[PDB]
Amino acid sequence: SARDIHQLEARIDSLAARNSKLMETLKEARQQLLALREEVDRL
Amino acid sequence: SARDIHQLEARIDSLAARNSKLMETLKEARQQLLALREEVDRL
Amino acid sequence: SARDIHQLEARIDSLAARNSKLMETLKEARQQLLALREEVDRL
Amino acid sequence: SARDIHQLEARIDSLAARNSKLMETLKEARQQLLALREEVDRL
Numbered sequence: 001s002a003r004d005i006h007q008l009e010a011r012i013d014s015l016a017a018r019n020s021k022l023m024e025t026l027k028e029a030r031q032q033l034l035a036l037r038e039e040v041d042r043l
Numbered sequence: 044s045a046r047d048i049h050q051l052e053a054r055i056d057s058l059a060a061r062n063s064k065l066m067e068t069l070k071e072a073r074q075q076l077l078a079l080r081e082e083v084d085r086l
Numbered sequence: 087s088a089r090d091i092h093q094l095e096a097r098i099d100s101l102a103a104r105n106s107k108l109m110e111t112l113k114e115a116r117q118q119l120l121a122l123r124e125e126v127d128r129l
Numbered sequence: 130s131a132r133d134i135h136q137l138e139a140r141i142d143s144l145a146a147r148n149s150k151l152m153e154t155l156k157e158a159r160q161q162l163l164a165l166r167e168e169v170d171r172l
Contacts (some may be wrong), residue, residue: 012166019073029061037141055123104158115147122140
């Protein structure tokens, strides 16, 4: 069943890649929100 | 000040685009987790 | 072995619960961003 | 109008709090995915 384990592994690896994509996208959003809050004060 | 508002709007629009990107990525993660739960069951 | 499976299933279910938590939180953020964009316009 | 800005600030603060909630939840999902990948290998 090495077949079964590498199939489960490929799937977990995929989920882990989407997790990293989510985190990097959230980090950019945090930066933009902070800039938005400074821009609202400059006004 | 049209200047100010159009700059605030550009930033909110960017945040809304990242919000959509996060949601589509999370929808794909849900699909993959569901398939992982069925693959685990099968064995 | 079903011991192994129940442990794997408990972990996947936990990940699925966090996935739902992320999606509901993102849905609230989308609504707030839309209201922010309407508030900016009104001014 | 001072309260135009405090309304906008309140809304941005709320979005930033949801952003932190998303990141914390995602950091927990990453840890659990990593443990799942180790548990699958134990098999």
